Amino acid sequence: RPTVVTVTETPRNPGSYEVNVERDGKMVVGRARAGSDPGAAAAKAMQMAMEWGSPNYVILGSNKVLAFIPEQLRVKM
Protein backbone atom coordinates (compact mmCIF):
# COMPACT_ATOMS: atom_id res chain seq x y z
CA ARG A 1 0.00 0.00 0.00
CA PRO A 2 2.79 2.52 0.80
CA THR A 3 6.03 2.70 -1.16
CA VAL A 4 9.14 2.41 0.98
CA VAL A 5 12.18 4.66 0.45
CA THR A 6 15.17 3.82 2.64
CA VAL A 7 18.32 5.97 2.91
CA THR A 8 21.22 3.96 4.34
CA GLU A 9 24.80 5.09 4.79
CA THR A 10 27.13 3.03 2.64
CA PRO A 11 29.43 0.96 4.87
CA ARG A 12 32.45 1.07 2.59
CA ASN A 13 32.67 4.90 2.44
CA PRO A 14 31.40 6.35 5.74
CA GLY A 15 29.79 9.75 5.22
CA SER A 16 28.07 8.92 1.91
CA TYR A 17 24.54 7.61 1.53
CA GLU A 18 22.56 5.53 -0.95
CA VAL A 19 18.81 5.32 -1.44
CA ASN A 20 16.62 2.33 -2.27
CA VAL A 21 12.97 2.31 -3.38
CA GLU A 22 10.55 -0.65 -3.42
CA ARG A 23 7.12 -0.22 -5.04
CA ASP A 24 4.60 -3.08 -5.19
CA GLY A 25 7.06 -5.75 -4.07
CA LYS A 26 9.75 -5.20 -6.72
CA MET A 27 12.57 -2.78 -5.94
CA VAL A 28 12.67 0.01 -8.51
CA VAL A 29 15.78 1.90 -7.33
CA GLY A 30 18.82 -0.02 -6.13
CA ARG A 31 21.76 1.50 -4.23
CA ALA A 32 21.38 4.85 -5.94
CA ARG A 33 24.07 7.46 -5.33
CA ALA A 34 22.57 9.91 -2.81
CA GLY A 35 25.05 12.68 -2.05
CA SER A 36 28.02 12.98 0.28
CA ASP A 37 26.29 14.87 3.12
CA PRO A 38 23.03 14.29 5.03
CA GLY A 39 21.30 17.19 3.31
CA ALA A 40 21.91 15.82 -0.18
CA ALA A 41 20.84 12.35 0.96
CA ALA A 42 17.61 13.79 2.38
CA ALA A 43 17.01 15.71 -0.85
CA LYS A 44 17.46 12.59 -2.99
CA ALA A 45 15.21 10.70 -0.59
CA MET A 46 12.51 13.33 -1.01
CA GLN A 47 12.95 13.35 -4.80
CA MET A 48 12.39 9.59 -4.82
CA ALA A 49 9.41 10.02 -2.50
CA MET A 50 7.80 12.40 -4.99
CA GLU A 51 9.02 10.82 -8.23
CA TRP A 52 8.29 7.33 -6.99
CA GLY A 53 5.98 5.82 -4.57
CA SER A 54 2.84 7.22 -6.02
CA PRO A 55 0.31 8.33 -3.55
CA ASN A 56 1.78 7.16 -0.27
CA TYR A 57 5.36 6.83 0.86
CA VAL A 58 7.60 6.42 3.88
CA ILE A 59 11.15 7.79 4.13
CA LEU A 60 13.46 5.93 6.47
CA GLY A 61 17.05 6.93 7.01
CA SER A 62 19.74 8.14 9.35
CA ASN A 63 18.51 10.53 12.04
CA LYS A 64 20.88 13.19 10.68
CA VAL A 65 19.37 12.64 7.23
CA LEU A 66 15.79 12.82 8.50
CA ALA A 67 16.54 16.01 10.43
CA PHE A 68 16.22 17.81 7.08
CA ILE A 69 12.84 16.31 6.16
CA PRO A 70 10.21 17.69 8.57
CA GLU A 71 8.28 15.01 10.44
CA GLN A 72 5.07 15.95 8.64
CA LEU A 73 6.60 15.13 5.24
CA ARG A 74 8.70 12.02 5.94
CA VAL A 75 5.67 9.70 5.95
CA LYS A 76 2.44 10.15 3.99
CA MET A 77 -0.39 7.61 4.25
DSSP string covering 1-43: --EEEEEEE-SSSTT-EEEEEEETTEEEEEEEEE-SSHHHHHH
Q: Please give the C-alpha separations between residue 44 and each of 59, 77, in angstroms, as whole numbers.
A: 11, 20
Q: Is 77 contained in some domain?
A: no
Beta partners for residue 8, in sequence order: 18
How far apart CA 76 and CA 9 sit, in angstroms, is 23
Domain count, the chain: 1
How far apart CA 19 and CA 62 sit, in angstroms, is 11
Q: Is 76 contained in some domain?
A: no
Q: Is 45 contained in some domain?
A: yes
The torsion angle over the Cα atoms of residues 5, 65, 33 and 19, rounded to 10 degrees, is -10
Residue 8 lies in domain: 3-70
Q: Is 57 contained in some domain?
A: yes
